[PDB]
RNA sequence: CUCGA
DNA sequence: GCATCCGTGAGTCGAGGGTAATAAAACCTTCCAGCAAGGGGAAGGTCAAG
DNA sequence: CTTGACCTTCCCCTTGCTGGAAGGTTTATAATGGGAGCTGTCACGGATGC
């Protein structure tokens, strides 16, 4: 199982797996009497965990310890729940500021009908 | 030069004491240049494509000719007769002319 | 009587005969029986024990085989080695029971999984040990025959005697040969060097006599393998000149393609399996074509293009060959990028790399006296008018700095590197005068204000443009 | 190669 | 010893035009640049008072 | 002549990758001896080879 067949099972780019091997995220794979990475189902499980973790909203380092919390057989899930609640709190903190951008942008887009004039009520506020 | 056959002769300049040597070429529009030439020993020689010299009857043996047919093609036979231990030849007067 | 080398090569290869269908099977059987002697004769050496140890300890932490076969074929051999290893010391090394355990640990050892790197590793291990004992024996032969002058007839009576203890060293000197009674000055080299051979004895565990027949079997098997390979290589030497007719596109000469295809064929011989029922010309054509098409892309170019750029050139040239037959007009790069599905500046970049250089002896008219190398102007030369004004400027700068008195002249000269070996920065020239960094800059500004006043720099007005 | 002395 | 075979020569000085052709493919590896906006710092150059 | 405050350019650095360049290794029906180019000079001297 080389690097191109694991790109079709999960969906990562072939360069991104070498990137995740470069930084400290996944289990290092064996070599095959030559310069060729070989892959077992453990690395497959780690990569299909990491792609889903990227798609739900975690960053590279909290997922980088989530994978280590998945590898060990203990996984006392109190800190797991703590990190997921911290993540949804981070999503709340981002979405409140982004909707604040929405509210502060809707109050200035009321005027300016769009005629052939040379003055604008929007270009004069920030200037 | 036009293609075809061409009989040429050097006026001298090869061997001393005259002995003009009449060579003969065959110039095709494309191909090798078959050539014939004489010698101061009055032999005949073939130079295929201006290579080294070669005895000219070796191109006749290559054409499936025996050395009986080669003498038949070029020469003119004089028949002899031996009857009752006599040595009498045949003679047409056109052959013996100026000996 | 000829000078064309290709006639010599074809006349030399013409003496050998082609092979039939069963001839290749015969030569493959010869190669397999040549390597099998090395395989079954390495089983009586501790390097094979090291190979067993590493190959089962690699899978300890672990047609494509099932893993249970790998866990089975490397398991019982360790316990059999445990029973064989101590029992050779029991009442004799080569006994009726000990040599039967030797054949036991040799015949159950056929658990091959033969990968050629881990096969040649054992031969590379054994050859340096045989070379170690060979250099020790040759140094003994060099000291005793050439320096102590004892004859080789009286030398082999005890050199073949033990080669472990020093009874050979002091027992043949009972016969004097009084040039060789001179040993009390030259004793200290031969026994001290024999401690090294005793070290090799205690490292391998096997004696001097029972290790030379091993390398004799290695030499027999390897010579049989090489003499088997030579006939298969020499027999198919017409296939390479049959393939190398086509790649004579003028980068390389005709003989270089044949000499690269022969190396391709020698790679193809060692890889060819006869088990699959395929003829040899089915396999070796790939390894000949690869070697020729690799050498023709690495060599045969003056400005050397990398291998992956040749594919980008050749795709463009195949598409530009197809577009001429299709459209009838020569393709512009803008409509060529539509077929190639590339940006247009990429295609304009690839169409710049090509066109290998013109020879500098080519004639540019139709002549033969005017070559191209008589038109190339040298541009690196400094102009003789630009090398005469650069001395008058140097003299005028040496002139006008004389009116500056004592401190601003030196710091102005070594601030711009004038008449110095190099330039000095602000702090390196501030550390010379007293300490100061800012005072040097103030002196420099005052000096530039002194130079800019129009009573000295009238001469340096016309040096500007 | 074509031309000039 | 001598017919034959091979190597080396064959005027000088100026113009003008020129300066080209075409040829595998899937796989793997390491290394470097760049990109969405800056932050940080280090080695040199000036300013305005004192 | 002195001190601190500011300027300059330039090199390195921050994620989550992606694009590209340069290098190496295989592929199993059967394929078994090249081809381009030369012929329209003359006169030696001197190796060379029976």
Rounded Cα distance between B69 and B71, Å, is 5
Q: Is B32 left (phi over 0), alpha (psi -120 to 50) or beta?
A: beta
| Under 8 Å between Cβ of A70 and A49 | yes
Q: Which of A68, A56, A21 is closest to A13 using CA atoms?
A: A21
Gap from A49 CA to E35 C1', in Å?
27
Q: Between helices C254-271 and C209-235, what is the axis angle to 10°?
A: 130
Resolution limit in angstroms?
Answer: 3.7
Domain ranges (residues) in chain A: 1-127
Q: Between helices A41-56 and A62-71, what is the axis angle to 10°?
A: 140
| Under 8 Å between Cβ of C77 and C83 | no
Rounded Cα distance between C222 and C127, Å, is 12
Q: Which of C435, C324, C451 is closest to C399 using CA atoms?
A: C451
| Under 8 Å between Cβ of A17 and A6 | yes
Residues 6+ apart with CB under 8 A from B38: B21, B22, B23, B44, B45
Gap from C411 CA to F10 C1', in Å?
27
Q: How many CA atoms lie within 13 A of C462 on its CB side?
A: 5
Gap from A55 CA to E35 C1', in Å?
21
Q: Which of C242, C271, C270 is closest to C258 using CA atoms?
A: C242
| Under 8 Å between Cβ of B56 and B23 | no
| Under 8 Å between Cβ of C16 and C238 | no
Question: Which residue pairs, CB below 8 angstroms and at least 24 apart, start in C188-193?
Answer: C189/C143, C190/C140, C190/C143, C190/C144, C191/C166, C193/C136, C193/C139, C193/C140
Q: Let me know the angle formed at the C-alpha of C386 by C384 and C390, rounded to the nearest 5 degrees.
A: 115
The 3 state secondary structure assigned to C186-213 is CHHHHHHHHHHHHHHHHHHCCCCHHHHH
Q: What is the C-alpha end-to-end distance of chain B, expressed in Å? A: 43
Q: List beta partners, residue C205.
A: none
Gap from C363 CA to F33 C1', in Å?
38
Q: Is A120 annotated as a binding residue?
A: yes
Q: In this complex, which residue's CA is closest to the C1' atom of nucleotide F18?
A: A15
**DSSP SS3 for B89:** strand
| Under 8 Å between Cβ of C56 and C74 | yes
CATH number assigned to the domain comprising residue C257: 1.10.10.10
| Under 8 Å between Cβ of C242 and C255 | no
| Under 8 Å between Cβ of A42 and A27 | yes
Strands B22-27 and B45-46: unpaired
| Under 8 Å between Cβ of C41 and C214 | yes
Q: List beta partners, residue C225.
A: none
Residues 283-312 of C with CB under 7 A from strand F: 283, 285-287, 289-290, 306-309
In angstroms and rounded to an integer, the radius of gyration of the C-alpha atoms of chain B is: 19
DSSP code of residue C42: G
The DSSP result for C135-182, as a single string, is HHHHHHHHHHHHTS---STTTHHHHTT-SSSTHHHHHGGGS--TTSST
| Under 8 Å between Cβ of C10 and C241 | yes
Q: Which nucleotides of D are covered by protein (CB under 7 A)?
A: 1-2
| Under 8 Å between Cβ of C302 and C325 | no
The DSSP result for C275-310, as a single string, is TT---HHHHHHHHHHHHHHHHHHHSS-SSPPPHHHH
DSSP code of residue A37: B
Nucleotide with smallest C1' distance to residue C367 CA = D1
CA dihedral sign, ordered B86, B90, B93, B98: negative
Q: Is A93 annotated as a binding residue?
A: no
| Under 8 Å between Cβ of C298 and C42 | no
| Under 8 Å between Cβ of A112 and A122 | yes
Q: In this complex, which residue's CA is closest to the C1' atom of nucleotide F27?
A: C286
- Helix and strand counts by DSSP (H, E) for chain B: 2, 6
Query: For chain C, what's the residue count?
Result: 465
Nucleotide with smallest C1' distance to residue C368 CA = D1
Rounded Cα distance between C30 and C83, Å, is 36
Rounded Cα distance between B47 and B55, Å, is 9
Q: Which of A51, A49, A52, A41 is closest to A13 using CA atoms?
A: A51
Instruction: Cite residues whose beta carbon is less than 7 Å from strand D.
Output: C 365-367, 369-370
| Under 8 Å between Cβ of C191 and C1 | no
CA-CA-CA-CA dihedral for C355, C357, C362, C364, to nearest 10:
60
Give the residue ranges of DSSP H helices in C236-377. 237-243, 254-271, 280-298, 307-327, 333-340, 344-350
Task: Tell me the residue range of the domain where C230 lies.
Answer: 5-18+217-298
Q: Which of C38, C57, C59 is closest to C110 using CA atoms?
A: C38
Residues 317-336 of C with CB under 7 A from strand F: none
Q: What is the distance, to the nearest Å, from the Cα of residue C224 to the centroid of all Cα atoms in its chain?
A: 28
Gap from C241 CA to E30 C1', in Å?
38
Q: Let me know the angle formed at the C-alpha of C435 by C430 and C440, rounded to the nearest 5 degrees.
A: 40
Q: Which of C410, C384, C401 is closest to C451 using CA atoms?
A: C401
Rounded Cα distance between A29 and C465, Å, is 68
Residue A6: in which H helix or E strand, if any? helix A6-9
Q: Which nucleotides of F are covered by protein (CB under 7 A)?
A: 1-4, 15-24, 26-35, 38-40, 43
CA dihedral sign, ordered A27, A33, A34, A36: negative
Q: List beta partners, residue B1.
A: none
Rounded Cα distance between C118 and C427, Å, is 64
Rounded Cα distance between C222 and C220, Å, is 6
Rounded Cα distance between A30 and A24, Å, is 16
Contact partners of A by the rule of 3+ C-beta pairs under 8 A? Answer: none
Rounded Cα distance between C410 and C422, Å, is 14
Gap from C361 CA to E17 C1', in Å?
18
Residue A14 CB lies within 7 Å of the nucleic strand E = yes
| Gapped junctions in chain C, after residues (C–N > 2.5 Å) | 62
Q: In this complex, which residue's CA is closest to the C1' atom of nucleotide E26?
A: A4
Q: How many CA atoms lie within 13 A of C355 on its CB side?
A: 5
Gap from C394 CA to E45 C1', in Å?
27
Gap from C279 CA to E21 C1', in Å?
39
Q: Which of C230, C231, C237 is closest to C14 using CA atoms?
A: C237
Residue C245 CB lies within 7 Å of the nucleic strand F = yes
């Amino acid at each position: 199982m080389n690097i191109s067949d694991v790109a079709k099972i999960t969906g990562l780019t072939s360069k991104a797996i070498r990137f995740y091997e470069e930084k400290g995220l996944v289990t290092p794979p064996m070599r095959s009497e030559n310069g060729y990475r070989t892959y077992t189902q453990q690395h497959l499980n780690e990569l299909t965990l990491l792609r889903q973790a990227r798609q739900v909203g975690f960053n590279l380092e909290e997922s980088g310890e989530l994978v280590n919390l998945f590898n060990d057989p203990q996984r006392h899930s109190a800190d797991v729940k703590r990190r997921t609640l911290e993540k949804v709190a981070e999503i709340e903190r981002h979405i409140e500021e982004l909707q604040s951008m929405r509210d502060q942008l809707l109050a200035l887009a009321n005027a300016c009908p769009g005629d052939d004039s040379a003055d604008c009520p929007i270009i004069e506020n920030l200037s | 030069r036009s293609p075809g056959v061409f009989f040429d002769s050097d006026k001298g300049k090869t061997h001393s004491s005259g002995k003009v040597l009449y060579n003969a070429r065959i110039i095709p529009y494309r191909g090798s240049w078959l050539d014939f030439e004489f010698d101061p020993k009055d032999n005949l020689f073939v130079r295929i494509d201006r290579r080294r010299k070669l005895p000219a009857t070796i191109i006749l043996r290559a054409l499936n000719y025996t050395t009986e047919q080669i003498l038949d093609l070029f020469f003119e036979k004089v028949i002899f007769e031996i009857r009752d231990n006599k040595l009498q030849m045949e003679l047409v007067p056109e052959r013996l002319r100026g000996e | 009587r000829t000078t064309d080398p290709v006639r010599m090569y074809m006349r030399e290869m013409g003496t050998v005969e082609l092979l039939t269908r069963e001839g290749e099977i015969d030569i493959a059987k010869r190669i397999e029986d040549g390597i099998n002697q090395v395989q079954c004769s390495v089983a009586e050496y501790p390097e094979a024990i090291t190979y067993l140890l590493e190959q089962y300890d690699r899978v300890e932490a672990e047609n494509s085989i099932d893993p249970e076969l790998a866990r089975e074929k490397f398991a019982e051999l360790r316990a059999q080695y445990v029973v064989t290893r101590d029992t050779i010391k029991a009442k004799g090394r080569s006994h009726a029971t000990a040599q039967e355990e030797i054949l036991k640990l040799s015949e159950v050892f056929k658990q091959f999984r033969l990968v050629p790197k881990q096969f040649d590793y054992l031969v590379n291990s054994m050859r340096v040990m045989m070379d170690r004992v060979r250099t020790q024996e040759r140094l003994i032969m060099k000291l005793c025959v050439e320096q102590c002058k004892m004859p080789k007839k009286n030398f082999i009576t005890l050199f073949t005697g033990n080669e472990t203890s020093d009874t050979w060293f002091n027992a043949a000197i009972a016969m004097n040969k009084p040039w060789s009674e001179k040993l009390h000055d030259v004793s200290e080299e031969v026994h001290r060097a024999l401690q090294k051979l005793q070290q090799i004895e205690e490292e391998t565990g096997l004696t001097i006599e029972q290790v030379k027949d091993i390398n004799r079997r290695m030499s027999i098997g390897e010579a049989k393998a090489r003499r088997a390979k030579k006939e298969m290589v020499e027999a198919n030497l017409r296939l390479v000149i049959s393939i190398a007719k086509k790649y004579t596109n003028r980068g390389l000469q005709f003989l270089d393609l044949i000499q690269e295809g022969n190396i391709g064929l020698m790679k193809a011989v060692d890889k060819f399996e006869y088990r699959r029922g395929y003829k040899f010309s089915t396999y070796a054509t790939w390894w000949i074509r690869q070697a020729i098409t690799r050498s023709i892309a690495d060599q045969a170019r003056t400005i050397r293009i990398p291998v992956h750029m040749i594919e980008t050139i050749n795709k463009l040239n195949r598409i530009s060959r197809q577009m001429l037959q299709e459209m009838g007009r020569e393709p512009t790069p803008e409509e060529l990028a539509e077929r190639m599905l590339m940006p247009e500046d990429k295609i304009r970049k690839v169409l710049k790399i090509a066109k290998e250089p013109i020879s500098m002896e080519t004639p540019i008219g139709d002549d033969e006296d005017s070559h191209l190398g008589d038109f190339i102007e040298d541009t690196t030369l400094e102009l003789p008018l630009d090398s005469a004004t650069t001395e008058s400027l140097r003299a005028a700068t040496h002139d006008v700095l004389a009116g500056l008195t004592a401190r601003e002249a030196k710091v102005l000269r070594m601030r711009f590197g004038i008449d110095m070996n190099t330039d000095y920065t602000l702090e390196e020239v501030g550390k010379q005068f007293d300490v100061t960094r800012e005072r040097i800059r103030q002196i420099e500004a005052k000096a530039l204000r002194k130079l800019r006043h129009p009573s000295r720099s009238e001469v340096l007005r016309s040096f500007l443009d």
